[model samples]
Target chain A: MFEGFERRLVDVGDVTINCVVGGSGPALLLLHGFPQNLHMWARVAPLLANEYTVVCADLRGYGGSSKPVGAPDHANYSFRAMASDQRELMRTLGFERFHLVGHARGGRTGHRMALDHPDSVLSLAVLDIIPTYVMFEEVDRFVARAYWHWYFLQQPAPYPEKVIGADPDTFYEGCLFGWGATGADGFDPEQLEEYRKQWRDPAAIHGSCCDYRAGGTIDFELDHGDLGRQVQCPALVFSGSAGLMHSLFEMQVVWAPRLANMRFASLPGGHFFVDRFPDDTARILREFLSDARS
Target chain B: MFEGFERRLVDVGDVTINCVVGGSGPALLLLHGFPQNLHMWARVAPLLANEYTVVCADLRGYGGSSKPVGAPDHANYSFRAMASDQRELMRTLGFERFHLVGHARGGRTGHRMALDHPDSVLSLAVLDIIPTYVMFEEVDRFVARAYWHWYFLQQPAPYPEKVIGADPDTFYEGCLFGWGATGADGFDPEQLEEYRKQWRDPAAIHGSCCDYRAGGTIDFELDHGDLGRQVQCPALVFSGSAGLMHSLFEMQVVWAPRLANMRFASLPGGHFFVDRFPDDTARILREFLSDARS
Candidate 1:
């Protein structure tokens, strides 16, 4: 659950980013990846609200974020274009440069953003995942085997659209549950119900497919053998204890060249650690961010 | 205060071990002393109930716990005696081993339990105390300089008893307000009332004094020198920043040798953190204890 981040639709071109803003220090923009919206940072943004300005936004086609109809092709979905959108929003809010925190698909987008526009990522926390290219190149059979939805999601137009749109709520519920699947206190009733409400719109289903489609067969092949791009900012990479992305050592394997000065840890929960164990999740983030800020 | 523990009256020969048990996972024993009984742990216990078998018991003549009125001198009030009573209660309930967690006078009792039977402690947690010895050694000066209650409670003879027993509820309320001093939350009318109802008993107050009287006088000297002998188990010590025990780092230094893997944290509220900030208090304990188990 996203905390302290503002929930407002930001109009950028035809797309509108559903953004959450909180805290009061230097600007910190949090962008989430596919399958989840700004709400993913709920538990995180609030704690940072008192000390720093924390801005979290759902990707254009995800969560409550708005996606303008364009080529669902690689061009519009490419992180180059997406990163520009974030820069514009931050510039609109008078933030020239800010720290970034990304997980899963967000980390992929963050990688593209830092690579394409180097100065933007002030400091970064790339959680549990490397760039999609690395994931695909050194395909993690164990992870991909379990998370088969990534492949099923990429089927043809008629099938992907029909199946996903059939029950967006339940689909999203399955998505959220996968993140904190191992924890004791499950997701809150109200938040889960809120997630389900997203399916009311037909366009959301279209956006979901397009977002993943953009990841595969598109950005993955563009810049082939150069996984060594550096984000240059001090980074903290956290890995889940029980997952294919289960070690800090993997970061060296993935982002080999520029992955220097990386701090890493194997955290307790799964993909949605921020949601499942908010206190532990926030405590680690707070510690890292506090030290970084100090 | 007892959080993961409960207190119920169980007739032990010549003594009653105020017993509480209704949680899951490993057994955790919580002991509370005088004026306040096992009720102190009521707020915090449920948090760990899903993961721990929280047990709260009354020491000696407190609450509905059994009273033996042992030896004329302070021998019966010794930590050894209290530990023995707790051990018997656990054995009676079929628990040969459990995590020992305690606070204030209860903290000393827990230390005694762990020292006497190290094998029984899965983990040991202490709340706001150096040792009974340090508290008693500095009692008069510490009382006048910070809290005056110690002076009032330990007045030798039956005069202290007569005055306190005259209107035990008010006497207890005085302690509550005196402890919180200026900044107690005003919205705790129900809680304050509940505490008053419990403190209305005369015997509880009399028993309460013995813990402090012995703490400040002979018990202080008897258990002198190296009060903090190192113990092997992990220890978590908690304190409030705004209370009389605010100079806690010094107190912790005193108890430093008592724990091997120690975790010290500051909870959000005053002396009665459980009552004033139940959610935060519960969260802290839950996270630490949860980590201890896993």
Candidate 2:
């Protein structure tokens, strides 16, 4: 679906990351969420390529990226580690600094990235999630029930891995179809197939579980540690009006303290807001990125 | 494993219940938990059988019982439905009044049975859980993180079904081995195999998911409806010392308001306290049940 984008794998010291980069202007690094690879950004990324150099890469354990086994503490899959991977990928691509846009798990990693490497990110845009630590503290039945996978995928290794591997297609499709307002209709057919392909790999399955395990554990710790420390970069927070975050919690109210300079909006669609409202989402990103630049 | 018990399937209107009947005195009906069947009670049941007429039955949709697809509102799999099934099973076995015991999913079922069929449950003993409403009300990251399956299994039907069915053995084994303090050593190998066997069936897999789905949704609603209405029986609450509910929340403090005559104790394991401390769990019940009757 990303017709003109060039696919490349970059070695980031401990791991290799698979990415598709194209477009030309200021660089924009796009990160996708859990149970999904870079392909989820296919429709959204290409649209933004006209205004900025768009780089969409799979998080270390997802898509075609390296699948490192999680540590005893699951530190390897922490957003800090993930932020480093994406940062290294951006550096390897010869960009010293770039605009960052992350969705779901990716949004979480971007949250960490802006905190851990503030100077490297010009502007940050997060989709469909509040701060990870906030989620842990304020979760109720609605939050827990709606975002069940956040806990399910975070379950210790081999359990989630084995289950996901047992029916990778269904697990993958379930997340895609189950999360959004449009259900399966929200996702592209080809992108869905690409997710199916990546899910079939046992390593990726384990890797993604590690990704979420880290989110629930070490990542939350990291976010908690930086609770009062706000992101210095101008930040844009976007969520689907019909999504869980929008419906359950006050997105802007919860996120306001985390970012010093923040712009917020609720877009049309659901959790997969970027894919559902690509043009509008991309326009918001473009406007936010440019606004932050000036 | 249940050598002297006679196994039989008794139809309970909508579905048939698979149960083992043995010993003779006052009737005692035992219900097993998630990722498990009636076999989970083998050790505990046989020990209790000597003192009372032990009737170990599978909750419908589990073990050798009939599996029904969940209704749109998940009513078919509601604890109300399950309670009725067990109530009918007890009635079919000629018991107008019986001591009730349940663990995990079964414990939750027992909680409902005591509430819905107050006259039938002479005394109710719940293993390793507070009321479902209490869970939803106080669910924090620890509760959400620990009992992740409560949410995962409750996700849109075939999704949990398909993912679990993908590799039922590992999924089943993961629960047995993962939950308790003693890990896999907490369970007997033969009982584990029986769980594995039941999990392999697509029907059982779907049925169990329906069980959980109902718990998170309609069951929560049912529990919410009966918020101030205390369980009208001499109630016994037991949990594993190292388990989620014990470690995270004050088990007795949580259960106190819900029962008028409640006794609480901490067992010696984790989530599967019944199997981990079978003798203690059974003894506690024996004393409580006999005392309540007197």
Candidate 3:
């Protein structure tokens, strides 16, 4: 039903990253989240595509993209490294600097991109997610219980990896169950079933879990050392009114020092508000960013 | 916005329940899901308000109502008993027969109401929920994570009772956090903060958890046994496309046999679709029920 989300395969490193690119303006890149590839933004992307040359790429080992053997070193799944890959992809596509928006795991890439390559990003939007460490810090027992996926992924590999691979359908189903709100209206059928099929790949599962591991074991240390290197770009952060990570925006002050401007908005759904409240999400982003210029 | 909603307080036994009655042509009772009171159907109620006498009641112990202490007898929290409360409320409000629409936990109540008073209900609509037993039937790690409140409420009352009673704001935030397909633009800030203020009452917190616990234990068993006692009225079951719950309506029929002129719809939203995606949720509820006559 969406008009301009044209999907294609672009070779990023050894893997073919699947992307939906459209829109026009100074290039802006958007990254997809976990349990979802680029499709979570399926509803919101269309709104931005016409204004910005929107590029959404499946982060490593996700969606219709190729799943390379995850490297033992953190480079394969590290947000900073992955952020670098997206930057290089933008360069290959002919852009020196661009705006970035990321939701769920996608926002981590935007955070790193701003920190690691500040000069390459014009503005960044973090959606319903905080910086890796702050998220963990802010998470309490309720958050721990409701969003145990973050914990599951952070566990040792093969357990999280093999368990998810055992019955990819069930694993995917489990992910869908955990991702949304508690009632009957939390998810759609075809999209949820499609999510199962897409995430069924073992590489995606392994890489995804490893992403958390690196966050716990390595990235935290690195981030601690790089304290002052806040993301140098202006930022717009959104969180659901009911979502636990709403407080993440304030931490942006600590994560991004050069923040010319930072705006926070709370919407209606859980962490996956992009799908549930697309029109509202789109309207808010449009209003906030559009007003940034005025 | 929406038209045809009537609000009042109806005394049921020892409790005074806040009631909103609207709609025309047919009498339909719209019961809201958990973590929300009757206002969940505020939008849905108005949608059909012009067509049917839509009676939406705030369940005892929630929202603008008198809290009645129930006997330790588990029946006090039973769905059949809860349905009786509505029956009594309807009688007090001078209602005869009506169609019932339920979403999430509301779906659970609707199912029970339909079973206990089949002749009383003219039609039925079960939103995105399956029988509680079915959810527990397939319960796994992720399901447990997503619905940890179930496990927590199942704990001996004093512990959960005390913890929640101590901090209603935390409980509401923690509870509502998993309410839908989350994005930054999912909810309204003023409303939620206000919700926090309202929920800060320790008594409301304990009462809410008690309601949830009843759903997990007594309400579920009763629902499972009454599976054969389908509502006599035509049924309407709806799921969402982008939300986390089941998307197909056919799955509902498998459990609900003897459904007369049943209708299945895929609305757009997450679990708390009633709140966050209120406009869309209302549109679907209105269009479907209004068109049902045609």
Candidate 4:
């Protein structure tokens, strides 16, 4: 889908990361959400390439990235681990500092990145997510219903993997379209196909399950320890006007404390607003990144 | 397993409840926990029978009870629904008012019972549980880890059921023994066999998943509405000395507000203390019931 972007498999200490690098100017990194890959940025990334060196990368355990069997504690798939891989990937690509834009699970990784490697990230934009600690802390029936997979995926290994593997398309597609999108109409057919190809792999299923398992365990503990800590860089938090999160949480109020220097806005679609409204998504990111540059 | 107890399927309006009736004095009902049935009380019920007329019954979706397909809202599998069944069972057996003893999920039912049908339950004895509302409200990494199944079993239908049905014995047995028991040595072979037989039923698995789903949804809403409303009956809250609940919570402090007229104690074993230390379990029940009589 990327007409000009170049695909590269970058080795980051423990595992290899899959990403596409292109564009010019200053460095910009885009990370995709769950049940999707860096391909989710296809529509939006190219739009920003003219003004920035845009890079879209898959988080570990998703897309073409290496899927390692999770450690007993599942720490290997923790956001910290995932964040480290991304930071190292950027460093290897010769950019010591960059603006980061992450969606869903990627947003969680970005949250951790801003906390753990503040000097490496110049500005951060999180799409459709609150802090992991806050999400778990404020969970209620509505949150549980809307984000059932958050808990489902965190179940002990092989259980969720086996279940999702039994019918990967139905399960993951339900996830892809279930949040707020009416159907598969909003997603690119090829992008949907790409997501299908990756999630069907048992190793990827287990690896992704481990990603959430770590979210509940190790990531939760890390977030718990860093409770009052704020992202040291300027931040932008985006929510979809039609998203479950917008309905459930006051997005800006929820993100305010952790993101002291923050800007908040709502795009037109659901959780996958970037995929659905590429021009608007790029415009919001462009505005935020330009303003934060000062 | 209950040599002297008589089994009967008492019709409680919508469904028939299976229970063993025994003992002699005051009317007392014993409710068992998740993945097990009336047979769980096989050891402790017979002992209580000598002092109080004990009715050990299966909650709806459990044991010999009728397993109705859960309502779309899962209201049928809710604790309020389960409580209604037990109250009707006791009333059907000619007890207008009775003492109620429940363990785990059963204890959750009793909590709702005391709230929804105060006049029917004269006193409440909950074994190894806090209120469901409190449990979900206070969930943290530790609680999430220990009670992982609480969230797992509550996943949207056919998912948890199919995954669990794939290896019912392994999944449920891990539940039966994984809690705090070191192994299967603490349980009776015949009793374990009985548990194995019932959980193997696909209907039972779906029914139980609905039960938990209801706990997170309908039941949570019910509990939320009734917050600060105390149980009108005298209550006794017991914890297993080495149980996950005891390790995670301060039993009396946690239960004190809701259970105004309350007493608390710790039995000598883990979550299935009633199974491991039947004599102590019975002795504690005897003391609490006797004191509450005045």
Candidate 5:
């Protein structure tokens, strides 16, 4: 799907990261969210690659990367841990500092990275998500209904694992289609097949569970500890007009206090707006990145 | 388990309620929580029977009561609907206005009953719970971690049903033990068996899911509609000292503003303190009911 991009697995201390890198300019790292992998950036990545050296990488436990058994505290899958992996991955690729763009779970990881390793991130752009801390703090019936899997996957160990494992395709497809999206018509069949292949593995399911578990526990505590702390780098927050988050929350107000130099914008489509509106997504990111650099 | 009590099915308009009636003074109706039937009050109900004509009934979609398929809006399973059933059950038993006691979900049903049918409720006692609106509005990480099922069960339809139905015993037991209780030793074997038997039924499992789904949607909206309105009846809000609700919230502070004439107390146990410390539980209720009458 990523026609011109060169794929590579770069060792980042504890684990090797799977990424597709292309184009030439200041480095711009792109991180994908849950269920899907780096392939989520397939449409948008090539578009941005011409302006920025776009590198699309799967977060730990998501796709072609390592899926280590989670620690009892689920610390290994914490955003701090994931952020560390990404920071080292960028360093290994000879980019000490890079522009960062992340969607969903990846947005969460970038948030931690910017907070914990601020010097390594020149600018940050998060797509279709709010802070993990804010989500738990303000979870009403609406948030719970829209993001039910956040709690379902966080259930103690084998319970969620076994439930999703029983029928991965149906469960995950329900997730993809359930969130503001009308149906599976928007997803590329090739990309969908790749997601199916990865999630079919039991470890991948458990890893994803651990990722959420940590979000509920350690990651939450970390965010709690860093409350009122602002990201020093320039930040861009993007929301999808059709997404529940966009409708329910004032995205700018939610992030403005946390981001020192912040900008906000809306795109058409749902949570996966980047996939459906690649040109618009790339154009926005390119503009934000260009302004940040200048 | 209900030794001196007589079991009977009383028609409450849309559904027949299964309950045990005993004692002779002022009538008092008791309701049980999720994954358990009227059997949960086995230890405490008999103790209060001497002072109050105690009727411990299973709410609709539980135990021996009818488990009608949930309506699309889950309105039928809402606390409003359950409260209607209980109020009708009390009236059918010849007590126009009666004292009421509920634990967990039953407590939620009672809360709604007090608000929706104020005249029919002489006094309301809710054991180990806060208002549905408050719980949703203030759901943080601790609340989510302690009550993950609130979100899980609220997932649209058959997903939660199939997952829990797969291994009802293990799932429900995990719920029983995981909540602050150390193990199954504290529970009476017969009572536990009754819970196991009821939850094992697929219809019962689906009913429970609908109950929670309603809690998130229709119930939440209903509670929201009554936000600042006080419960006109006298109220008792009890907390189990070791329960997450007790540790996380000021129970009195949460309920006092909503309940016009409210009293609060705590007993030494977890969420199921009534089962563990029936005497203490009964003593608190008897004291509260006597004062309310005076």
Candidate 6:
């Protein structure tokens, strides 16, 4: 899926992590979200690569990464496990510290990573997300409407796996269009195909299902356990004004207390705003990480 | 799909309705819900047919039924329009007042019918649903999680149609297996195939989307307008104790104000309880209609 980037499958503990690495300056790690692989960064990753060394990878269970069957407690796909994979991957790549940015579910993993392995991350940026713990606590009708897939994907295994598996392309397309008002025009056709291809993988389907199951179960418990912990990295939170995060709660109010240092803003467009306007999205990330830049 | 039942398509003003007719005494109309056709009542309908003239028909955007493109207002798929189809089908079958029983989305239609065509419906039996208007008014995170589709399918057309069309069976299977702990083991495999067949049809797919869109929009408005006008007929309300409806709200408390004489109770299984325990479900319905039975 990567044209200019080198595809590398790094063995990280129990799983294999697929990553596309390119660019030349500061080390930067990008995590893509649900029903999509690293290709979700097709528009934005290449743009970011111009300035920083960008490593765009699929979350475990989502792309070329190995998808283990869910554990009894669903810890296998929990953000803790997912974050651990990335921590090891970064370590294997010989980068102890890197700028981190994540979108959607990837953004979720970034949140956990900053909290759990603060020293490894120099700075963190999250796209279209509030903290996961806050989500469960302050969830209202609007929040549920905007992220219905959070519930849908978590509905026991084989159920969601079987459904999305029926036509991964359809399920993927539905999610892409359903979440944002920007439509397919926001996505590259080839990028969308890469997403469809990964989604169509039986392993990818089941893996994403497990990820959500953990999100609803053990991940929530983990967040509850770490409710008192603050994210140690300097953090930047970005969400589309037209998206659910903005409608349900103010960006600053939800994220401010949890971070050691924080900056928050709303941009134009919908949930997948980064994909919709990659140039603006890349520019914002650059400005946010001005300190990390050479 | 129906082996013994007579299949007929009745002209109901704007649309032609497909229905399965069987049984021999007092008339009973069985309406199915979303991602399913009248075949959802396959097990229960045949049992009911032994004592009553059971008419198991697909709702307007479902099964062999006609699928009209949605109106700008989405009134084309409104419960008002759907209820009218059932009302006319009953009238065409020489039934002036028939016992009406509906499940899920169909139950919402039955709720509307009792209000809009009160003179023609002898009694209304709703399964796993409260009134739609009250639902929207009282909506919370719990309600949204359980009935997310109420918002999802209600999104503007082509969006849902295209996604679901990407693989209708996947979407259909998700709903069937996702609803209950009972799993697909609760359903008849043959009947499940019938649902898949209808769901795969392009028109049926669009029709169901319109039905939900209307439910969230115009249907909500219609229900709002009739908040004060109680259903004149006797009504029976049933939900699964294991289902979201029971957990989220008190059934009696929710339904009491909307109907003149109402009986409410919970069953043993989840959302698709009727399929899981058809005998118990049918027995309850038979007892509810004992007074009306000749």
Residue A274 lDDT in candidate 4: 75
lDDT by residue for model 1 over B96-193, one digit each (tens)?
98887777667788887777788877778777665665554443322332444444444443444555555565455545545543244632565455
For model 2, residues A1-294, the per-residue Cα lDDT tens digits are 789999999999989999999999999999998677898888888888998899999998888889987888999999999999999999999998999999998998898888888989999999888788888888888888888888887777777877777677777777766765546666677877887888798888888888888888888887878878989889998888887678888888999988899999778788886666777887888788889999
Screening candidate 5 with a backbone cut-off below 3 angstroms (N, C-alpha, C), the clashing residue pairs are: none
Candidate 4 lDDT, tens digit per residue, B191-255?
Answer: 88888988799989988899999988888889999988889678999988777778888888788
Candidate closest to the true structure, highest DockQ = 2
Off by over 4 Å in 3: A1-4, A137-140, A177-179, A182-190, A247-260, B1-294
Residue B283 C-alpha lDDT in model 1: 80
How does candidate 3 fare on TM-score? 0.49
What class would a CAPRI assessor give candidate 1's docking? incorrect
Q: Give interface RMSD, every candidate, in order.
A: 32.8, 1.0, 16.5, 3.6, 2.5, 2.9
Model 4 stretches astray by more than 4 angstroms: A1-4, A23-25, A50-52, A69-75, A115-119, A137-185, A213-234, A286-294, B23-25, B50-52, B115-119, B137-145, B148-171, B177-185, B221-234, B290-294
DockQ winner between candidates 1 and 3? 3
Candidate 4 versus truth, CA RMSD in Å, comes to 3.6
Predict model 3's lDDT versus the native: 0.65
- In model 6, the clashing pairs are B154-B213
True contacts kept of each: 0.00, 0.96, 0.00, 0.09, 0.46, 0.33
lDDT of candidate 5 over B1-294, digit per residue (tens): 878898999888878889999988999999999878999888788898888999999988999998899999999899989989888888888999999999999999988888887898899999899778888888876677677788778877777776676667767876777654535777888788999999799988988899998998888888888888998777899888887788888898899889888888888788887767878888999999999999
Candidate 5 lDDT at A56 equals 88
Q: What's the TM for model 5?
A: 0.86
Prediction 6 TM-score vs. true = 0.85
Query: Model 3 fnat?
Result: 0.00
Candidates 1 and 6 compared: the better one by TM-score is 6
Model 4: lDDT to the true structure: 0.85
Model 3 lDDT per residue over A1-294, tens place? 346567677776766677778887868787877778777777677887777788878887677776565556555677776777788788878889888888877888887788788889888888877677654555553444455566556544455565456456544544443444423265555555556667766777777777776665466666666665556466887776655445324545544443557877778766777767778877887776676546
Residues B86-121, candidate 3: write the lDDT tens digits: 878877766767767887766777777777777777
- TM-score for each candidate, following the candidate numbering: 0.47, 0.92, 0.49, 0.85, 0.86, 0.85
